[PDB]
Design a protein around this ligand. Structure first.
Ligand code: HEM
Ligand SMILES: C[C@@H](O)CC[C@@H](C)O
Length: 396
């Protein structure tokens, strides 16, 4: 049934977990909403708003005061279990915890990690090259972010195979494993690292965040658990999705493979343009004050779902948004791939470096590649949309 403050003409049944046609094209599936009202109420998933036009997505995402990050998701209970830091915090509390995390991920540290992260991408590329084909999502995209994670926290080289296998439960969620079991599995995986780095700080990512104060006092052990869980989960599916979309683009645009092999100096600019072009992250908020938007009122307690694709790819917000082009002069902060305002991805710098290093190694090390002739590209929806299969072929 429809709440009184929701006009009948704003009602849709859009399921954010499986948008119609999402398996063929995630972007086209979401863009169907640009043909309707800029703020719609879906009856699916318990009933919630969906921001459905660029200016609305952008405005509501940035309103951290009236639209709280506490809820995490439209699925009940998920946020209550995960308690991510800083992702789910508001206001002064959020600022106090974000501060040391952002310090940990600053550009100087990202730049210092570039050679190690490049070596990880190169090693993985070289393991696949002799085959002449791969299932890129399962053989590369879903493998790289966990390998990078182990590098970021500097695990001993000899523990990597064990730690890589332990990690597979978390990079590729299965079921029936409940949210509580997944939280517990993540914590148990992370605990030995945290214990070591809080006792004996090194110079890795965890050590550097955990040796900083929060609001002038030490991290508690539970806050460390919550923050570390956020760092692990925040960099896994998002990076896998983006790397897959970048590879899919190149496979479909042999002219861009040729361009970036001829002009490797265009890789950074191509990484920024591809990140703008293929956003797949959507977020939830819960209203803590009434919010007027697009001629309706989101009431306290209502949930709001915000798809970044409907800012970046809305022709009303950006000109010819589906063209990959180099004359936009657009700082990455001006689009919504990494979010907006107070909660904007702390890993934004690191993600850009990972995509650049991927392009350098894949293009530099691989011959010309293409989609397989008889297998399809499939995608999925949910909060982080992604390729589920990407079959590539090349002459080895
Ligand atoms: C392609 C890569 C990535 C994309 C597209 C992405 C996207 C996003 C977006 C949209 C947000 C804002 C969420 C919101 O407003 O509720 C965010 C926040 C965040 N991301 Fe990322 N991210 C990526 C990579 C990473 C990496 C590599 C890490 C860390 C290893 C990371 C960790 C975080 C954390 C901790 C937050 C919470 C920041 C806060 O609440 O203040 N992300 N990310
Ligand atoms: C929880 C989901 O909607 C967003 C998670 C990204 C921001 O890491």
């Amino acid at each position: 049934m429809i709440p009184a403050h929701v006009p009948a003409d704003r009602v849709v049944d859009f399921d954010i977990f499986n948008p119609p046609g999402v398996e063929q094209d995630y972007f086209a599936a979401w863009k169907t909403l640009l043909d309707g009202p800029g703020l719609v109420w879906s009856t699916a998933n318990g009933g919630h708003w969906i921001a459905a036009r660029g200016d609305v997505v952008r405005e509501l995402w940035g309103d951290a005061e009236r639209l709280s990050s506490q809820c995490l998701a439209v699925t009940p209970g998920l946020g209550k279990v995960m308690q991510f830091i800083p992702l789910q915090q508001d206001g002064a509390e959020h600022k106090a915890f974000r501060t040391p995390v952002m310090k940990g991920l600053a550009s100087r540290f990202v730049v210092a990690l570039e050679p190690k992260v490049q070596a990880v991408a190169r090693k993985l590329m070289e393991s696949l090259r002799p085959r002449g084909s791969c299932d890129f999502v399962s053989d590369f995209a879903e493998i790289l972010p966990l390998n990078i994670f182990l590098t970021l926290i500097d695990v001993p080289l000899e523990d990597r195979p064990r730690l890589r296998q332990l990690g597979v439960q978390l990079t590729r969620p299965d079921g029936s494993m409940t949210v509580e079991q997944l939280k517990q599995a993540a914590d148990d995986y992370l605990w030995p690292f945290i214990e070591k780095r809080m006792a004996q700080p090194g110079d890795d990512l965890f050590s550097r965040i955990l040796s900083e104060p929060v609001g002038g006092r030490p991290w508690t052990v539970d806050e460390a658990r919550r923050m570390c869980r956020n760092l692990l989960f925040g960099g896994l599916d998002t990076v896998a999705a983006m790397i897959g979309m970048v590879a899919l683009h190149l496979a479909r645009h042999p002219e861009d493979q040729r361009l970036l092999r001829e002009r490797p100096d265009l890789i950074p600019a191509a990484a920024d343009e591809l990140m703008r072009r293929y956003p797949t992250v959507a977020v939830s908020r819960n209203a803590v004050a009434d919010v007027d938007a697009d001629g309706v009122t989101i009431r306290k307690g209502d949930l709001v779902y915000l798809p970044s694709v409907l800012h970046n790819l809305d022709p009303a917000s950006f000109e010819a948004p589906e063209e990959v082009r180099f004359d936009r002069g657009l700082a990455p902060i001006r689009h919504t791939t990494m979010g907006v305002g107070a909660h904007r991805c702390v890993g934004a710098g690191l993600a850009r470096m990972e995509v650049i290093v991927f392009l350098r190694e894949w293009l530099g090390g691989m011959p010309e590649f293409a989609l397989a002739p008889d297998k399809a590209v499939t995608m999925k929806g949910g909060n982080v949309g992604a390729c589920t299969a990407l079959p590539l072929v090349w002459r080895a």
